[PDB]
Every structure is written in C-alpha cells, then in structure tokens.
Design a protein around this nucleic acid. Structure first.
Lengths: 57, 472
DNA sequence: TGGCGGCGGTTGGGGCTCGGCGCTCGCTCGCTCGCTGGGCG
DNA sequence: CGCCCAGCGAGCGAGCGAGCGCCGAGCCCCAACCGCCGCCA
C-alpha cells in the first residue's frame, strides 16, 4: 500500500486502453476532441493507436 | 564548530503513516500553497506542495524546541528538505553549542515526543525510524557523527533540483543557495577548487612515542626493553599493537638514516665533571698525546669540519689504545660495520647502511682505493656491494685502527705505494704504541659520550696537518 | 655420432591480518516523586 | 498552628557511549612438484 500511484502521460491510453479489443471493452466516456471519436468505435481507436505509434517513432 | 546530522522522515502517505488523522489537519496542510522567491531558477512543477508545508512545519518546530532546550538562540543550523528514492527526509543540521554528545539522545526523544503531541497530535508515524540522528557507524555501536562545516558543500549542495525541494538556514554563507541552483553550483565549485594531516587519540600518542624512541636511541626490541620492560610490553599486547612496533621501528630507522650529522647522537647532553676517571683520557695521556687536543681533533673529525682531512688513523700494534676506543664507539653508535680487509672484492659488505666505517686490523686494498678516496676526501660516490645493488655513501668519518703501514696498499698478490701521499694527506696519524695493561678494562658507551661532550666544552685551534701534536 | 641424474620457479593451502558489523557492558543526567523544615509570627 | 512553599535529596530509567567478539574477506609464507641444466660411451 505504501507504493506510489501509477502516474503516466497521454501515451498510456493508446498503449493499453485503445489496443484492447471489443471483448475487453464495453463503454467509455471522455471529452478530448481527438479521443472522443475513439469511444465506442474500434476503427478510430486503431487509427489513434497507429498515429501514436508513428509519433513516438 | 561541529554539527549533528539529524534525519527526520517526512510522512508521505498521511493515510498509511498517520492512520486516523483528523480531516482538519489534512485540509490545512493541503490548503497552504508555496511559491519560490523571485530570484529562484528552481522549477515549481517538480517541487511538491503539501509535503513542503509538512517539512516546513516539522523543521520550524524542531528549531524552536532546540532553541528552547539548548538556551542558544544564536546557534547556526542548516535544514534541507529532499525527496528520497522511497520516502521523504530532511538533512537537518544543528550546532553543538550548549548541547554535548551525552545529552543529544534525550533532547532528540523530547523533540520527537513534542512533535508527535503537537503536529501529529499524539499519532506517532509508523515509518521505520522516522526520527533518528546520523551515527558514525550503523547500529548501536558508532556514536553521534559530529560533522564539520565542509559537510554542507560535500553532500547537501551537490544535490540539484531533482533531489532538492527546499532548504532553510541562517548562515550568511549559505543564504542565496537556499532556493537557487546557480548559487549552489558556484559554492560547490569554489569548495572543490579550495581543497594535510589527521588528528586522532590513537595517532597522537604514536607521534610522541616515535619521537621519544629516537630521542632515547632505540632501534630494536632489545633497546626498548633496556629502558623499561613494562613499557615495551604495553605496546605489544594485541596484533594491532604488535604491528605498530614493527612500523615504529622501520620509521625510526628510516628517519635516523636522515638526521643531519652523526655527532647529533654521539655528543652527550649534560657536561662532564670528572674527565680524569674516563678511560679515554688515560688512554690518550698514556700514549703521549694531549687529551684536550685529541678530543678537539675527534670532535672536528666527527662533525665533518675538516672535509678532505676528515679522517683519523691510529697506528701501532693492535689493542694499543686503538681497539678499545673504536669498539666503544661502535657499541655506542646505532649501527656500525667492520671493513672486511680479507674480501678485496667487497670489503665494505658489513659497512652497508652504517653510520661509521670501522677498520679493525685491516690493510688497505687497491680494488676500492679510488672509490674510498672520494668518501675520505669529502665526496659522494656509489660503490658496489656483495651480491647487492650499489648505494650512495655520504661523507662519513672513517676510523682506522691497524698495526701495519696502511700506505702499503695491497693489490691482490702484490703491494704498491702509489697511493701513499694521496691517503696520507687526508688522514691523521696517531702513534699509539703504548700497550694497555690487562686490568685496564673496556671503555663503555657513557665514557665515549662524556669524551665527545668534553671535546666541546674545551675547544682549541685544530691545525690541518698529518702528524698530530703530542702532549708536552 | 647417442640418453640418465639433479636444481629454481611455482601456487594453492593453512595461517595471520585488518576491518566491519554486531552485540554487550559502564556512565548519565533532566525528571520525577516524595520527605521534611524555618516560618506563618 | 497545621499547613506552606520549597528546598532537599535519591534515585531513575531511556539514552549515551566504548570496548570486545566473531566473522569476513584478503593478503602471505611455505611445501610437493615441473622446466631446465650436468654427467659418460
């Protein structure tokens, strides 16, 4: 319990939350204009994942 | 002025370290915001907020309690709030003015209790040793670590923004370096550019023992027992004390190897009150030689005053007031060596690392006549050794005590006289033909010391010549 | 054209060594908690 | 006159050591053997 919290940046979303497939997802709520389209749409999630992969590269 | 490095762990998790803390305390700790001074290049995003206030309150209460219990409000301190790898802490520093090392433990516990009853309000932090003081050794063995002023720029200031958060100090030399990386780096660089012995209770006594040994003239274990057996035994109880004996012996030898002059150890301290009783006086008066002039010549020869003619040669058969004095001198001086006249290849084998060169019943050899003339004429020269490397032999007063004519320099299976005048123009002839009686007794070391001392109390004009004046 | 005999190096192993850490004995000293004594007078 | 500070003391335990003990590696000297050489037809 004394450990530190899991602090991350925006790169953590496309690295674990978006890569998750439908069976590992049900619903989501956000407010960012870039991530709002990737709520219940898998195509937008994959597009954002690819964009993040190309950016970090 | 020393300082005490106190470690005070700042509770990071108020829920785990302070279970059951009131909500008012957390609210007041979180509502207090901080802001760096205008001239502060430190980044505020990296610095925390509630931990900063907690550390500030803790160090303020600590300083207040210290000033109240020590009665020294003008005492210097130096607090530095950092962020450990797994928990927050502070490198608090307080002077030792008005607080000895045997009372710091009670004051620390009192301050901890006061902080727990005031700040935390009874709740004691559950961190492993949240309140302690730096010790010279881990555990309950080492004592309080009394650091120095050089400890601040050697561990605290080197730390930069990542590990640094805040700091409080009243010292005028560390004011701008409280919340400024540039000033801290400048001070660290200045301290590194500025920067010898060590004072300890175990080395202070050794520094005096090594000096007393050379004063008494000890160069081995037997000489130490000769003075006091109990004293020698006391300095060799444990292995650490036994190795110390060998270390001190080696150091004393290497130092005696570099004194200044041999007479420094041969010349006595107190004057002489009865020289007639000395055996040297009778030996010199029996052979027909003025004891005063002989003593002056000996003093001038031992002090390297003549230079080229700094040599004495006692002629006449063996043991005629020649061997006794030489044996006494050899027994008095620390080290000595007999010139092996038989070994013409390396006759100075026994005279290696010796202060006096004694030639007892030995003829001159042609194999080391040229090299010997240098040392006899006041000149340095590196001669070989018997199955050993060469070694420089500084101008040392040589003493010859033979019966045959030393001018007859032997060159193997023959004899020559080419080195007659060269060797005679740098030596003193002492025609000591009178033989001592059987009940004359051997000369002691105290006798030689008294003789060398009396040689100084009555100085006479010593003439540089070959034949020494006799006693008229 | 031919081989049978000893001497300086090793080189790990039993041993001394200096250190660390760990523990275990003397000293201590602001604090506490009573006991009692001119003085009220 | 039966309390008054209030002055005194006697520990008094949580500290402080400091001093030793017992590993812990870490050098250090020593002995049972290898390389090379002397010794004869």
């Amino acid at each position: 319990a004394g450990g530190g919290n899991k602090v991350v940046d925006e790169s953590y979303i496309p690295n674990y939350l978006l890569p998750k497939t439908q069976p590992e997802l049900q619903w989501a709520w956000t407010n960012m204009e870039q991530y709002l389209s990737a709520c219940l749409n898998l195509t937008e999630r994959k597009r954002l994942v690819a964009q993040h992969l190309t950016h970090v590269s | 002025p020393g300082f005490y490095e106190i470690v005070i762990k700042v509770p990071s998790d108020l829920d785990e370290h302070l279970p059951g803390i009131s909500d008012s305390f957390v609210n007041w700790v979180a509502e207090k915001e901080w802001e760096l001074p205008p001239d502060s290049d430190m980044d505020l995003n990296l610095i925390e907020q509630a931990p900063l206030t907690v550390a500030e309150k803790l160090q303020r209460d600590f300083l207040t309690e210290w000033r109240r219990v020590s009665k020294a409000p003008e005492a210097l301190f130096f607090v530095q709030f950092e962020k450990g790898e797994s928990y927050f802490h502070m490198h608090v520093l307080v002077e030792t003015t008005g607080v000895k090392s045997m009372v710091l433990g009670r004051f620390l516990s009192q301050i901890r209790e006061k902080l727990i009853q005031r700040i935390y309000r009874g709740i004691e932090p559950t961190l492993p040793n949240w309140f302690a003081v730096t010790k010279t050794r881990n555990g309950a063995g080492g004592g309080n670590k009394v650091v120095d002023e050089s400890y601040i720029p050697n561990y605290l200031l080197p730390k930069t923004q990542p590990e640094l958060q805040w700091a409080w100090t009243n010292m005028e030399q560390y004011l701008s370096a409280c919340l400024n990386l540039t000033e801290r780096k400048r001070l660290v660089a200045q301290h590194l550019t500025h920067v010898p012995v060590i004072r300890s209770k175990t080395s202070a006594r050794y520094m005096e023992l090594v000096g007393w040994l050379v004063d008494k003239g000890i160069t081995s274990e037997k000489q130490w027992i000769q003075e006091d057996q109990a004293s020698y035994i006391s300095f060799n109880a444990a292995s650490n004390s036994r190795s110390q004996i060998k270390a001190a012996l080696d150091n004393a030898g290497k130092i005696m190897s570099l004194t200044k002059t041999a007479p420094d150890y041969l010349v006595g301290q107190q004057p002489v009150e009865d020289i007639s009783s000395n055996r040297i006086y009778k030996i010199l008066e029996l052979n027909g030689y003025d004891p005063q002039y002989a003593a002056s010549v000996f003093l001038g020869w031992a002090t390297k005053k003549f230079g080229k003619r700094n040599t004495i040669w006692l002629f006449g058969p063996a043991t005629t007031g020649k061997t006794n004095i030489a044996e006494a001198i050899a027994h008095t001086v620390p080290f000595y060596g007999c010139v092996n006249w038989t070994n013409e290849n390396f006759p100075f084998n026994d005279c290696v690392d010796k202060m006096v060169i004694w030639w007892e019943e030995g003829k001159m050899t042609a194999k080391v006549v040229e090299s010997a003339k240098a040392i006899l004429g006041g000149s340095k020269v590196r001669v070989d050794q018997k199955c050993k490397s060469s070694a420089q032999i500084d101008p040392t007063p040589v003493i010859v005590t033979s019966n045959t004519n030393m001018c007859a320099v032997i060159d193997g299976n023959s004899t020559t006289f080419e080195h007659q005048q060269p060797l005679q123009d740098r030596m003193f002839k002492f025609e000591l033909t009178r033989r001592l009686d059987h009940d004359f007794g051997k000369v002691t070391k105290q006798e030689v010391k008294d003789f060398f001392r009396w040689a100084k109390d009555h100085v006479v004009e010593v003439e540089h010549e070959f034949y020494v004046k006799k006693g008229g």
